[PDB]
Amino acid sequence: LPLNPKPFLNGLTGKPVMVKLKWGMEYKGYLVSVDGYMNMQLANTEEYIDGALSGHLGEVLIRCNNVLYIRGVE
Amino acid sequence: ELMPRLLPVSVPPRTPQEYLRRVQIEAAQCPDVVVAQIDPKQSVNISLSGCQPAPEGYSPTLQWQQQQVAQFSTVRQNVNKHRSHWKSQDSNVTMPKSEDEEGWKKFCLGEIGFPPLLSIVSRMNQATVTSVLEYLSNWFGERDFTPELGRWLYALLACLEKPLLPEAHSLIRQLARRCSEVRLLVDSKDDERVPALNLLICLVSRYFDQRDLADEP
Amino acid sequence: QPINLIFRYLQNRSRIQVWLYEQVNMRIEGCIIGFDEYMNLVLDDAEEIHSKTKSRKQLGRIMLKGDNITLLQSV
Amino acid sequence: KKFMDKKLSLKLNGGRHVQGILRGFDPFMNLVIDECVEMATSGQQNNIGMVVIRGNSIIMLEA
Amino acid sequence: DDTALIKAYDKAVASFK
Amino acid sequence: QKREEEEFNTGPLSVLTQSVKNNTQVLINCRNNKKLLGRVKAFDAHCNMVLENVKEMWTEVKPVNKDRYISKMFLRGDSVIVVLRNPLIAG
Amino acid sequence: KLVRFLMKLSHETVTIELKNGTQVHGTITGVDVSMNTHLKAVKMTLKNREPVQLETLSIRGNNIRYFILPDSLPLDTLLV
After folding, report:
1. Which of B72, D50, G37, G42 could serve as a FRET partner for G28 with CA atoms 20 to 30 Å apart?
2. A1 in Cβ contact with A59 (< 8 Å)
3. Backbone dihedral region of D53: left (phi > 0), alpha (psi from -120 to 50 degrees) or beta?
4. In 3-state terms, what secondary structure has residue C7?
5. Which residue in D has a C-alpha nearest to residue B5's C-alpha?
6. Does domain F1-91 have CATH number 2.30.30.100?
7. C2-12 vs B16-29: helix crossing angle, rounded to 10
8. Are C6 and C35 in contact (CB under 8 A)?
9. Which CATH number goes with the domain that contains D47?
């Protein structure tokens, strides 16, 4: 069966995620919380510019409209 | 909008709209908000300093500050009014380029220098005003505070037209810090520097809206 | 009409490529496995295709936001 | 709405333009372009099959 | 008054007491 | 607004409520490529905010820290990228 | 919603970071729900340019980065 966005995405919460931003920076962390616009909340947040680690950021809100894609991590 | 709609509306569906209705179902089913409790560390943000408070006795009175912030405005009002007149006159005065830090430093304090005449300042554009303040901050970092400087800073400020660039906001802060710091060295109230330092702090904090830096007594 | 074309891509599971709204040097390729009216796409076997440099990053399965779709083509 | 099946060179945000021929459209100005061609900024053309496009993204729409 | 900026500063400094 | 307020409490927008509730500062990453350190007075779903006692902080050409102070601000959600909660701040 | 608050701001004067970084000072006349802001007695401040005075100006909501509000503005009061 087709795996659809909200299900798939909901399915992601609790687990490590890699959210890539429109602007190129991407953010690795634990996907705490999610909502109706797909605003996102990460934890143990690491930040990568150009793929290069730049900083550690802890708990973080990601405004939904900055998101290019999100994915799984193991 | 934050998520706009681009597309319209137990066995596989044969038509798209029937698919999307079907999907709209399965996700409406789904819990909009979800929260995943977790169990088991941070990087540092080099936020700059503020301004060093005055030693007991030296911090100036709100009434005075307030008076300085008021009068300055009149200056700046007058400075504006007659800009055009002083724009056109200039016998010696090889005004350095906006690029020439070292030449703009010697120009103002010299190695003695030119004071800030309206004839001289009124020609200087906003970008130069900015730059010149900067160099004069840089000459301050590395040397004793002089009244030539005080008048020069003061004057550069009077010409500084707001709304300020965030660049110019930041520069006048870095400046005022140095003032507040250079203030800690003083041994007696009768020091020349004291009031000058206090003014330059004052005008920045109160006139230029950089209130976090201000001297509260 | 064009919603159907996408629905096709799904049924056939064609490998596709998205032109992005805010990025020109980069595109995303993947087999598409689901989507909603906002055009958010679940992509399978996805990859970033950088221009200039040419370097394809394996993303595996991903969810793409609809906002970033300039255009859709196949392979 | 009548431009259908007529050959157009389209420009989109980011400096990207495209000769292809309309073949379908919805209320959301989502377009279906056929026999389509990616126009580079060096004089090189890539033919890229059939393609969908958002109503946004596009600026210019020329025959 | 060309030195007017100077005098203002001067005036302003001399106000502190 | 029943579920909206509970939405804030519970959803990723809880980051902004705690600041509104606990007079606590946050660190926002703004598209101006600059950061804003402030206390959220009020916000909405689209992430539009009123902020108190803000410090705008950024770096420039060997790169040096810069900042500026804004007392009261209306931020447009449109400009917000990410919002750290209870950040780490030093000299 | 917060826009409902912004629309209360007629006759307040403010500075607006534009998305280009331009800083724009003036007095609000009206605001609408798209966040579009009409001003009078205008002062722009441009990067490598001299300033610019305008009699009035009309700015797009989607071009505003933020508003620097007057300090006077009593927020608590208006958040209702």
Report:
1. B72
2. no
3. beta
4. helix
5. D28
6. yes
7. 70
8. yes
9. 2.30.30.100
